[PDB]
Design a protein around this ligand. Structure first.
Ligand SMILES: [Mg+2]
Ligand SMILES: [Zn+2]
Lengths: 190, 153, 69, 14, 248, 1340
């Protein structure tokens, strides 16, 4: 609207300022009443395709992983490289940028120290083992999945990672419902 | 199946057209079929003549009397023994379907609220299991030959 | 998708449970399937130990018992 | 002439 | 089943089975009476619509119920989703529910539980003590000692609840932290108290939200409610390593 | 100045005067049922217009008429309260006169013979109570209104999604009140299409060809002609100048001498101007240009006689040469310019296969009733029965208005059914929407949604029932014989009375009354539901009709709806709204003259209000109606703006005209977020009426209109003088001038002591006056549930403080002092009911004998020897209330126990015990017992003792009414009869009974003598007959269900206190569950020891933006600051000169306010009584948007010696040190919603089990277990927990013999289970095998 409600909630709002504000409290409630019925069907399907998946082996053996490069948002970073690769195995042991400087060994958990050790050094990407590439039949090995839990250990053999993964993606959404110049390429760096 | 019998027994020499004779054997059937396969808990055919008489006569007393009919005035108007009109009233009601959605039209039906009585309380079964303790122990505290006949009796 | 990939599973109970049911019993009955109960949602229906968690241990002994002593 | 009719009462009279 | 008062409450299948056995019973007759092929050929066409109103009613003229105006409910409309299965996708005994409140004097691993409730969930356990300690001769004589609320049971009920973890769980259980065990402590009132730190896991404001409580019966089921599910094991949410017991 | 005013005058802020008074709040209901049952000798809506919509029923070619004369509503048999006790509806029989005239079979149509059938009785119709609430089965129900689309023509587009390439497809629609639909529309290729209710699509010309229109006339109505002539040179075409609008010409532009344009150039505005100046009518045209047209009409070969060209056939050059010689010159084409004149009807002329009328109906038939083969007289029959048959199509009285109004036609009256002139106009106006010169109509606009009250829904259901009787009277008047039957053998009372009785008894609308307040009932009658029969659905309707259009301003409340699945589909009506004559909602507006604001008030509809320019209620006027501002704020076309002082047309009435009746009582509503002020209007219809409420310390002045407009108060009906107060009766001695002419006497109001509402709360009234009060017309005599002296007190108001106290109010929860439990201010009363019926089994009948098998005498202590409990005996859980035993044989007892009997000889009883015992967890006296017996079974001793006690009361007041009403009959004539003969001291020696022989002079004194006497004899006959009729319905039996022998209903009056778990809440949507009840001394005490009584949390105000509470907590403190400043002055008994000095300074006290409260009041006996009601606190008031500005508050605190900032320093309660940084302390009016704790907490260890599947449920005083639903099993597979999961769905719920072991293992201390397979899976194999499918289990 062209004219904004120009008085706060310490002075009154006359009738025409209140009928204007009364709308947004309707679109507010007609969505939270609907975002529950809608996100209650998105997590009911995720936990019925990912139902039968279970850590069913102690280690697979495959040498094929992925590369975890930090996301780059133009002049800003969306996520640091460390907080993306914490708690994971390492397919090919990265070294210092100088050759033959193998600091992190062959595949090992990247816990709170091996990250910062790779924080002291200057590596720009790591090749970690992902669960989309494990070679096991009917399940995934333990090392391929990784580290995370409510606990801190590696993921125990037998744990049902299928259903605790479809709920972590469905429990949000209930609250996640939904200067523009662009002239000069101006970066903070040199 | 009615009209198939009318033309079976049709006789034309009496001159009466087929319609004014086939109309009897036809309406004969559909009023005999309705009394045979219209109810879940079937009531006999000789009784539906009595139920239908109670509405043909409880409707005629509804206009004259104006107010409504009583359980005894039918006994006066008709000729029943004042109690058969009280047994003919406890019959004609049909069975409520066990999926009729109860009030508020929630996600609930009538079939979710009718408990069952064939079962027994597991404290009623936990006693009879316990009772065999005493009658096997108390009755074991008898003599031998005098307890066997007590158990065989 | 997640809606068409949960239909084409090997079982016919983990599909008939949540998806369209009239079409998953028809197609399974014609072919004569044999659901081997190697899952969770097909294994809580029958009412026994789900094969992941505290119940996964005892399933180590059940597959180690058939095809042998 | 069979205009996708289903119920028999349509098919009886016809 | 006969309702109370004379009416019966039939299932909606005895309305459909009577409609096949009746039509099939007539078609047995027309082949003995030898009707023309305009009728018997109309019979099979009428039977076959009644067998297919039994299997999956609705893919036809929708043979609505008699004596009422809603459609009947055939066999294939019984497995068909109510949003989920007919079997287990199970209402449950040993349960309850009440209005939660605050109670900020509790430790992290215990929740209140009213005397009037705990005396009703743990009934079969209490019957064990009153017949083990010899206080009741037989079980029928123990059922009348718990109904009087004699002053002895209030001290036997406290030993039944020594280390018996119960399971509090709120209604729209989104994630695995929505179910957590607790070691009860008997209070007086009718509100299930609850440690304030955990109320951000259930997402529970204290303005009328209720919470069921269950009871793990067997001996392996009150260790799984103490090793795996206890409330002091879950201080890291599974979606990410960030804590879940932040003072709110 | 009313005598209720001078008992307590509420101080009133607010500046704008009030011009319109709040109307009678129940006109929505009480008025639109008066239209229904009332003699209307004309054709308006009403019952009389329902018969004329059917009668007279002309016979089926027999011509023996049946015609309607008049009806008449008899009186009910029972009155209201007898209809609520006895348990049967409150109706009124209906009588109709019908004349049956039998014409002559062959002779002239003369008055042959007839019989005036003496009022064939055709059903009962329920009657509305005094307040607007029906009584269906001893339960007052309420019929909400409905908000549905009005019948008319609604053009609409549905842009965007269609075809994924734009292509707005503007369609029409025609919705009648009764009959099929009709739905034109476009397609993605600009071809009109017609549709029915929803059948397959048809080319839209296929209906025009059915109306007997040929391809020529179809193209004559739609297009314009372009005449062509051939005057032996180059085919000169006529031309008007305007015909060249926006054209791209491409010929040799010649006209009237001058070549204006050139080939490949567009036409100018001055190009046209060269045409009128030149008078350009005929031009030269090329010979190839005519190959891009279509023939106007048919040109046949006049030379030969073979059709050369038919309409809608574009031109071929040979056809020109075929035409250049054919002997024709009056050629014609179609004016079709693609910019504004599209040939939309042309193309559908080609896709239409049918080209003659009879072969179009055969196409309409073939798609309206598929399968069957067509005919001739059938297809003609169906089409003229669909729309133009007055019985099966009735647009409306209103539908014609919205129809003519939408086509810009003249009048508003018209035939109810369509015509050929209407289907054409809609197609044109639909086409004009496509070409640009029209606008569509959004469905949400409140000028397209009418309101159906009760009187318009019952009749519409009645007339549907009336037709059903017409179906049988014909076949009995045509198939049956007409020899001697009367007009009482064909009419049926069961079908007609069933068509309506099912309406009030079951519907989406005819719902129970939410009756736990004087405000939750009065806001349930003004609901405007959009659901119901013939309306929306909670899952179909999207966000489009859940939002708030800018037309709701003044008609429907924006800030009061539910919050569940139907937010925005309930829409409680507004405060000043009133429906139109047709049904559309309207609102008052002060007519604004040239300069001055008048007061003649107009009600504007929803489509009229969008024209004028309307000011706002808050615009100052200089005591003459002139704005003091040259510019004002207005809203003109649905938008806000500024305008000139002399440019507005209307100004709104007042400031509280936008809001509902619910949200009009929140004080400081303007300071609240619309979110949390929406939870305010839903926590005042749930507040329970406490023991004896007091008042709102900070009201909003719109309370007296909610406790008088509802029926809870016993408002005085004629002014006078109270003569006998009592806890259950008031006797108002009427005044003189308000007294009837002859035989008037006095009035009397009965009260209604402790009775049971619909939620089991109590509703009892109390007197508030004493002996000698001058009552007046409209005064108040009896408070009700939550009213006080007329005001509407919903709850108590208690000293509240905002501070976090030790974590005992962590979340929204609340703390509570123990001084709020001792004083018993939140203790409410509840009144249950228990019923014990003794059916008539087939094994013998049950008994209500007071002997019960093997029951200890401790249980049979309360109930007397007759079997029923006493009256007043305080019972508790598990006690006995009605001894009842049922006959039981067929023992066959077990073998082991069969030894147990022989050992002790315990006689097995013939009868099983099934008495009624009080439900667990309840305790309260038994305040009332009633007994119903089937007429034909003897009354026991207790059944008579009950009956006689009301037999002595029924005749007591019915006769004692004379003994008190005789008191005034003589005393009125004694004050009159003293003349006309001197008899004043002889008037008592002359017997007051024996005055029929003598009398007085011929005046009203004597006119009253035989006046009183003839009804004196008739009050010997009429009162005595009122005794027999009263003493008749007492003794007789009852009308029970079939089989039932005798019922027994028992009441309990339990009195529940407050406790942890309850749910208190203020007015501003700040809920909270009481967390603890402290002692008296832990609560923070201020400087003078007065502890606070609640401790709210201050972390609720920053996020939830309700700053109402923090302002009501201060103005609630200034008001109670005057309370302790007067209570001290009145306690030293200073003088009535000091009070009138203070109380007068406490009333001016503002800034340009409109009170004028004081100084006309009595000398000392009224001020000391006004000041004696203000000692608890002077009730401030605050209108909704004319609030109390902050400076006006602070100036009231400074008069009370309180600190201006509103924050004191509280000392801790336990330690004794002082909280640094002072705390707030005020007086917040606190409700107490009825989500009590001891109705929420269930628990179950073992109980009933369902029937088909063996899981648990609650029908045996042990409700089901919880719902371990599908969402909660994924939270037990997330953990590895798989032993908890197995027993939670095998042993604890569903297995049959795996759980009877798990109950015997538990009692022995062996916690171990044997699962087995659930019984809810074995039913899933029997339910699959019962199809063709075969299902089994392998073996290994
Ligand atoms: Mg909550
Ligand atoms: Zn692997």
């Amino acid at each position: 609207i062209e004219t904004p409600i120009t008085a706060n909630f310490r002075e009154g709002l006359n009738v025409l300022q209140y009928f204007i504000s009364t709308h947004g409290a309707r679109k507010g409630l007609a969505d939270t009443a609907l975002k529950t019925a809608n996100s209650g069907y998105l997590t009911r399907r995720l936990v019925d395709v990912a139902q039968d998946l279970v850590v069913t082996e102690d280690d697979c053996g495959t040498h094929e992983g992925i590369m975890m490069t930090p996301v780059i948002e133009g002049g800003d970073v969306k996520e640091p490289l460390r907080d993306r690769v914490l708690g994971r195995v390492t397919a090919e042991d990265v070294l210092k940028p100088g050759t033959a400087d193998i600091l992190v060994p062959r595949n090992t958990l990247l816990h709170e120290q091996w990250c910062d050790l790779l924080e002291e050094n200057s590596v720009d990407a790591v090749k970690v083992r992902s669960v989309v590439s494990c070679d096991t039949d009917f399940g995934v090995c333990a090392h391929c999945y990784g580290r995370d839990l409510a606990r801190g250990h590696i993921i125990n053999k037998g744990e049902a990672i299928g259903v605790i993964a479809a709920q972590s993606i469905g429990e949000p959404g209930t609250q996640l419902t939904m200067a523009a110049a662009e002239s000069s390429i101006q970066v903070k760096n040199k | 199946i009615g009209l198939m019998k009318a033309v079976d027994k049709f006789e034309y020499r009496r001159g009466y057209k087929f319609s004014t004779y086939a109309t009897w054997w036809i309406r004969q059937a559909i009023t005999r079929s309705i009394a045979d396969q219209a109810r879940t808990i079937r009531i006999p055919v000789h009784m539906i003549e009595t139920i239908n008489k109670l509405n043909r006569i409880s409707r005629q007393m509804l206009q004259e009397m104006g107010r409504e009919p009583t359980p005894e005035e039918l006994a006066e108007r008709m000729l029943m023994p004042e109690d058969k009109i009280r047994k003919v009233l406890k019959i004609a009601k049909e069975p409520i379907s066990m999926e009729t959605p109860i009030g508020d039209d929630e996600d609930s039906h009538l079939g979710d609220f009718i408990e069952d009585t064939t079962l027994e309380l597991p404290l009623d079964s936990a006693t009879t299991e316990s009772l065999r303790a005493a009658t096997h122990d108390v009755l074991a505290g008898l003599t031998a030959r005098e307890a066997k006949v007590l158990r065989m009796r | 998708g997640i809606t068409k990939a949960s239909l084409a599973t090997e079982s016919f109970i983990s599909a008939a449970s949540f998806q369209e049911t009239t079409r998953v019993l028809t197609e399974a009955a014609v072919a004569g399937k044999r659901d081997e109960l190697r899952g969770l949602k097909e294994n809580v229906i029958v009412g026994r130990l789900i094969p992941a968690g505290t119940g996964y241990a005892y399933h180590q002994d059940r597959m180690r018992r058939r095809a042998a002593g | 002439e069979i205009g996708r009719t289903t119920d028999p009462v349509r098919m009886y009279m016809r | 089943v006969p309702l109370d008062g004379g009416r019966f409450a039939t299932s909606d299948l005895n309305d459909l089975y009577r409609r096949v056995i009746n039509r099939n019973n007539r078609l047995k007759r027309l082949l003995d009476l030898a009707a023309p092929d305009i009728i018997v050929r109309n019979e099979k066409r009428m039977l076959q619509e009644a067998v297919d109103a039994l299997l999956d009613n609705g893919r036809r003229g929708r043979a609505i119920t008699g004596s009422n105006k809603r459609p009947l409910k055939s066999l294939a409309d019984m497995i068909k989703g109510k949003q989920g299965r007919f079997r287990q996708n199970k209402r449950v005994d040993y349960s309850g529910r009440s209005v939660i409140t605050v109670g900020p004097y509790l430790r992290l691993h215990q929740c209140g539980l009213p005397k009037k409730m705990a005396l009703e969930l743990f009934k079969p356990f209490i019957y064990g003590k009153l017949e083990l300690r010899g206080l009741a001769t037989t079980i029928k004589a123990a059922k009348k000692m718990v109904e009087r609320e004699e002053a002895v049971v209030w001290d036997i009920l406290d030993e039944v609840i020594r280390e018996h973890p119960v399971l509090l769980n709120r209604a729209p259980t989104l994630h695995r932290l929505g179910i957590q065990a607790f070691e009860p402590v008997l209070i007086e009132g009718k509100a299930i108290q609850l440690h304030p730190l955990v109320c951000a896991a259930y997402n529970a404001d204290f303005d009328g939200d209720q919470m069921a409580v269950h009871v793990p019966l067997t001996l392996e089921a009150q260790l799984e409610a103490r090793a795996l599910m206890m409330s002091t094991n879950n201080i890291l949410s599974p979606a990410n390593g960030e804590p879940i017991i932040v003072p709110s | 100045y009313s005598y209720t005013e001078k008992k307590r005058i509420r101080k009133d802020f607010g500046k704008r005067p009030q011009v319109l008074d709040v109307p009678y709040l129940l006109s929505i209901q009480l008025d639109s049922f008066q239209k229904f049952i009332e003699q209307d000798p004309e054709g308006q809506y009403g019952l009389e217009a329902a018969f004329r919509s059917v009668f007279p029923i002309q016979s089926y070619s027999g011509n023996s008429e049946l015609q309607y004369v008049s009806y008449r509503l008899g009186e009910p048999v029972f009155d209201v309260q007898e209809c609520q006790i006895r348990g049967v509806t409150y109706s009124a029989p209906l009588r109709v006169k019908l004349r049956l005239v039998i014409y002559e079979r062959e002779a002239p149509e003369g008055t042959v013979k007839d019989i005036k059938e003496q009022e064939v009785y055709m059903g009962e119709i329920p009657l509305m109570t005094d307040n607007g609430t029906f009584v269906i089965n001893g339960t007052e129900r309420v019929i909400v209104s409905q908000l549905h689309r009005s019948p008319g023509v609604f053009f609409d587009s549905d842009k965007g999604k269609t075809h994924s390439s734009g292509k707005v497809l503007y369609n029409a629609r025609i919705i009648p009140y009764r009959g099929s639909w009709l739905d034109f529309e476009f397609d993605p290729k600009d071809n009109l299409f017609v549709r029915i209710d929803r059948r397959r699509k048809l080319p839209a010309t296929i209906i025009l060809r059915a109306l007997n229109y040929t391809t020529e006339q179809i193209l004559d109505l739609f297009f314009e002609k372009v005449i062509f002539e051939i005057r032996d040179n180059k085919l000169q075409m006529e031309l008007v100048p305007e015909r060249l609008r926006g054209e791209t010409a491409s010929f040799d532009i010649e006209a009237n001498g001058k070549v204006y344009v050139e080939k490949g150039r567009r036409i100018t505005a001055r190009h046209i101007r060269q045409l009128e100046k030149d008078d350009v009518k005929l031009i030269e045209v090329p010979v190839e240009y005519i190959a891009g047209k279509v023939v106007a009409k048919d040109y046949i070969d006049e030379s030969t006689g073979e059709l050369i060209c038919a309409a809608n056939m574009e031109l071929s050059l040979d056809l020109l040469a075929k035409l250049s010689q054919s002997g024709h010159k009056r050629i014609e084409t179609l004016f079709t310019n693609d910019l504004d004149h599209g040939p939309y009807i042309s193309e559908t002329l080609r896709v239409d296969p049918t080209n003659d009328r009879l072969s179009a109906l055969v196409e309409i038939y073939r798609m309206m009733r598929p399968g069957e083969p067509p005919t001739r007289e059938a297809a003609e029959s169906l089409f003229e029965n669909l729309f133009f048959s007055e019985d099966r199509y009735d647009l409306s009285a209103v539908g014609r208005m919205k129809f003519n109004r939408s086509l810009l036609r003249e009048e508003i009256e018209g035939s109810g059914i369509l015509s050929k002139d209407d289907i054409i106009d809609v197609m044109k106006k639909l086409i004009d929407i496509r070409n640009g010169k029209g606008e569509v109509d959004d469905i949400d606009h409140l000028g397209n949604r009418r309101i159906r009250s009760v009187g318009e829904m019952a009749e519409n259901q009645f007339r549907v029932g009336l037709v059903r009787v017409e179906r049988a009277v014909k076949e009995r008047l045509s198939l049956g014989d007409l020899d001697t039957l009367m007009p009482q053998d064909m009419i049926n009372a069961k079908p007609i009375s069933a068509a309506v009785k099912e309406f009030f008894g079951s519907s989406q609308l005819s719902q129970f009354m939410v009756q736990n307040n004087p405000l939750s009932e009065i806001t349930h009658k003004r609901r405007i539901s959009a659901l119901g029969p013939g309306g929306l659905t909670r899952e179909r309707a999207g966000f489009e009709v859940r939002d708030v259009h800018p037309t709701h301003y003044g008609r429907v409340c924006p800030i009061e709806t539910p919050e569940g699945p139907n937010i925005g589909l309930i829409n409680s009506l507004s405060v000043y709204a009133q429906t139109n004559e047709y049904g559309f909602l309207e609102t008052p507006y002060r007519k604004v003259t040239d300069g001055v604001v008048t007061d003649e008030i107009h009600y504007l509809s929803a489509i009229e209000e969008g024209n004028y320019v309307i000011a706002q209620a808050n615009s100052n006027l200089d005591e003459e109606g002139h704005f003091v501002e040259d510019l004002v704020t207005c809203r003109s076309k649905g938008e806000s703006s500024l305008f000139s002082r002399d440019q507005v047309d209307y100004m709104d009435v007042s400031t509280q005209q936008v809001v509902s009746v619910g949200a009009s009582l929140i004080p400081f509503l303007e300071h609240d977020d619309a979110n949390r002020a929406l939870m305010g209007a839903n926590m005042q219809r749930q507040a329970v009426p406490t023991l004896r409420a007091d008042k709102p310390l900070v009201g909003t002045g719109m309370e007296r209109a909610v406790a008088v407009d509802s029926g809870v108060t016993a408002v005085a009906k004629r002014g006078g003088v109270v003569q006998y107060v009592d806890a259950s009766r008031i006797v108002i001695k009427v005044n003189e001038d308000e007294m009837y002419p002859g035989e008037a006497g006095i009035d009397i109001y009965n009260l209604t002591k402790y009775t049971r509402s619909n939620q089991n709360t109590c509703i009892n009234q109390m007197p508030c006056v004493s002996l000698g009060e001058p009552v007046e017309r409209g005064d108040v005599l009896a408070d009700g549930p939550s009213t006080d002296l007329g005001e509407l007190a919903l709850g108590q108001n208690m000293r509240v403080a905002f501070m976090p106290w030790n974590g005992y109010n962590f979340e929204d929860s609340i703390l509570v002092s123990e001084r709020v439990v001792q004083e018993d201010r939140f203790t409410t009363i509840h009144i249950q009911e228990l019923a014990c019926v003794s059916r008539d089994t087939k094994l013998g009948p049950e008994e209500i004998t007071a002997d019960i098998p093997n029951v200890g005498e401790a249980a049979l202590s309360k109930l007397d020897e007759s079997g029923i409990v006493y009256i007043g005996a305080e019972v508790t859980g598990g006690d006995i209330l009605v001894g009842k035993v049922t006959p039981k044989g067929e023992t066959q007892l077990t073998p082991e126990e069969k030894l147990l009997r022989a050992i002790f000889g315990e006689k097995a009883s013939d009868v099983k015990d099934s008495s009624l015992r009080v439900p667990n967890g309840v305790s309260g006296t038994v305040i009332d017992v009633q007994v119903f017996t089937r007429d034909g079974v003897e009354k026991d001793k207790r059944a008579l003792e009950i009956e006689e006690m009301q037999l002595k009361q029924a005749k007591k007041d019915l006769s004692e009414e004379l003994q008190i009403l005789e008191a005034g009959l003589f005393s009125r004539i004694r004050a009159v009869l003293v003349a006309g003969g001197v008899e004043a001291e002889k008037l008592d020696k002359l017997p007051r009974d024996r005055w029929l022989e003598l009398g007085l002079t011929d005046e009203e004194k004597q006119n009253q003598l035989e006046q009183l006497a003839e009804q004196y004899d008739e009050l010997k006959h009429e009162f005595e007959k009122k005794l027999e009729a009263k003493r008749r319905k007492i003794t007789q039996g009852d009308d029970l269900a079939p089989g039932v022998l005798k019922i027994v209903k028992v009441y309990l009056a339990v009195k529940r206190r407050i406790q942890p778990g309850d749910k208190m809440a203020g007015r501003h949507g700040n809920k909270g569950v009481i967390s603890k009840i402290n002692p008296i001394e832990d609560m923070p005490y201020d400087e003078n020891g007065t502890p606070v009584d609640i401790v709210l949390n201050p972390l609720g105000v920053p996020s939830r933006m309700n700053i109402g509470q923090i302002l009501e907590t201060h103005l609630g403190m200034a008001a109670k600051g005057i309370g302790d400043k007067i209570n001290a002055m009145l306690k030293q008994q200073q003088e009535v000169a000091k009070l009138r000095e203070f109380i007068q300074r406490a009333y001016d006290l503002g800034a340009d306010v409109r009170q004028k409260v004081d100084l006309s009041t009595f000398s000392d006996e009224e001020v000391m009584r006004l000041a004696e009601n203000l000692r608890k606190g002077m009730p401030i008031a605050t209108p909704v948007f004319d609030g109390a500005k902050e400076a006006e508050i602070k100036e009231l605190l400074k008069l009370g010696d309180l600190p201006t900032s509103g924050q004191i320093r509280l000392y801790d309660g336990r330690t004794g040190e002082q909280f640094e940084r002072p705390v707030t302390v005020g007086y917040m009016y606190m409700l107490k919603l009825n989500h009590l704790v001891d109705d929420k907490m269930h628990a179950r260890s073992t109980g009933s089990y369902s029937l088909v599947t063996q899981q648990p449920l609650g029908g045996k005083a042990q409700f089901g277990g919880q719902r371990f639903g599908e969402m909660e099993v994924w939270a037990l597979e997330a953990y590895g927990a798989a032993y908890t999961l197995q027993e939670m769905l095998t042993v604890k719920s569903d297995d049959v013999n795996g759980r009877t072991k798990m109950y015997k293992n538990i009692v022995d201390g062996n916690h171990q289970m044997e699962p087995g397979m659930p019984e809810s899976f074995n039913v899933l194999l029997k339910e699959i095998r019962s199809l063709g499918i075969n299902i089994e289990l392998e073996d290994e």
